[PDB]
Amino acid sequence: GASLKDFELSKMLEKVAKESSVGTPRAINEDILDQGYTVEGNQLINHLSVRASHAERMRSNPDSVRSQLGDSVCSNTGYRQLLARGAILTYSFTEYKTNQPVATERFDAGSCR
């Protein structure tokens, strides 16, 4: 099992996941639903669904997707506090109709540097 400190971090992340999930699912735009947050170990995971056409645009340029996500995460004051405590921010995008993976992008303190 996870160490005492690791399990505690997961519990802290679960508090963030619960508050951040209030009001989800909700539309980010016409193509993307914010489905809220879960925690797996040291990862705070934001789950999002993406419609088929936008999913294709995402798949065609995964480095640009990652870079834009990184810019957002790494300048988010609250996320920076989590990364500063050993957390990983994970974005899990799946297809709206099928739930097939589209993109999965993880960020740690190292990523932000």
UniProtKB/TrEMBL annotation:
This is Secreted protein. It comes from the Bacteria. The chain holds residues 20 to 131 of 136 of the full protein. Transmembrane segments: none annotated. Disulfide bonds join C74-C112. It comes from Pseudomonas aeruginosa (strain ATCC 15692 / DSM 22644 / CIP 104116 / JCM 14847 / LMG 12228 / 1C / PRS 101 / PAO1). Keywords: Signal.
